[PDB]
């Protein structure tokens, strides 16, 4: 027993087979989701505006995840996340789907990043961590000895605006690297405090 709940923004649409038990919750969530969503434009150029059904389902996932606290919307979050995985991931990873959207479809980089953020955020709010060993081709090749992997870490001079990379990491992968970023800032502040004259070097703090 399921029912089709249609969530859409202009021409793009996607229908969810929600169980009748929580369809009412899902429907009020759809209502509020559209109450927050901006109006369709011609071509989907505005920011915070989906361009593909994948992007819209991702944004719905992000909104529902923002509502769930680590529980009433947890089941609907799990259901729509499962629908997204079944339909758009094709048993592939979120970044593969993102690259496909960027290349084939008329998707921009910020829309790709926020779609990825919404998917991962939904995964961690739905009690669905990435604790399963990924079957990525490169690492399967490494495991069977076909490929050899060397990590190289960059340094200075690569870019004049390295901080936007840290920023985009903190936004796109907030729930993932949030502990790392908070820890790094904590020990950096502690080192500044315990260093003799570090504050002089850090005029605007750290």
Curated annotation (Swiss-Prot):
Gene source species: Saccharomyces cerevisiae (strain ATCC 204508 / S288c) (Baker's yeast)
Taxonomic placement: Eukaryota, Fungi, Dikarya, Ascomycota, Saccharomycotina
What name does the UniProt record give this protein? Fatty acid synthase subunit beta
- The portion of the full protein included here is 5 to 213 of 2051
What does the function comment of this entry state? Fatty acid synthetase catalyzes the formation of long-chain fatty acids from acetyl-CoA, malonyl-CoA and NADPH. The beta subunit contains domains for: [acyl-carrier-protein] acetyltransferase and malonyltransferase, S-acyl fatty acid synthase thioesterase, enoyl-[acyl-carrier-protein] reductase, and 3-hydroxypalmitoyl-[acyl-carrier-protein] dehydratase.
| Quaternary data | [Alpha(6)beta(6)] hexamers of two multifunctional subunits (alpha and beta).
UniProt similarity note:
Belongs to the fungal fatty acid synthetase subunit beta family.
Share any extra remarks: Present with 91800 molecules/cell in log phase SD medium.
